[PDB]
Amino acid sequence: GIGAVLKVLTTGLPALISWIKRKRQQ
């Protein structure tokens, strides 16, 4: 289904928030 597929390209990128924001807001 796409429910999540369209929710990945709308905020961050699934886990990116704990990937780059975790590496940038340190």
Swiss-Prot record:
Q: Which keywords accompany this UniProt record?
A: Allergen, Amidation, Antimicrobial, Cytolysis, Formylation, Hemolysis, Ion transport, Membrane, Pharmaceutical, Porin, Secreted, Signal, Target cell membrane, Target membrane, Toxin, Transmembrane, Transport
Per UniProt, what is the name of the gene that codes for the protein in this document? MELT
Site label Important for the flexibility at the center of the helix, flexibility that is important for the stability of the voltage-gated pore, positions: P14
Phylogenetic lineage:
Eukaryota, Metazoa, Ecdysozoa, Arthropoda, Hexapoda
Additional record remark: N-formyl-melittin major has 80% of the activity of melittin. Melittin: The secretion of this protein into venom follows a seasonal pattern. This variation is synchronized with phospholipase A2 variation, i.e. their production increase in the same months.
Subunit comment: Monomer (in solution and for integration into membranes), homotetramer (in solution and potentially as a toroidal pore in membranes), and potenially homomultimer (as a toroidal pore in membranes).
| Residues annotated with Glutamine amide modification | Q26
| Whole-protein coverage range | 44 to 69 of 70
Q: Which domain of life is it from?
A: Eukaryota
Which protein is depicted? Melittin
Q: What is the effect of changing T10S?
A: In melittin-S
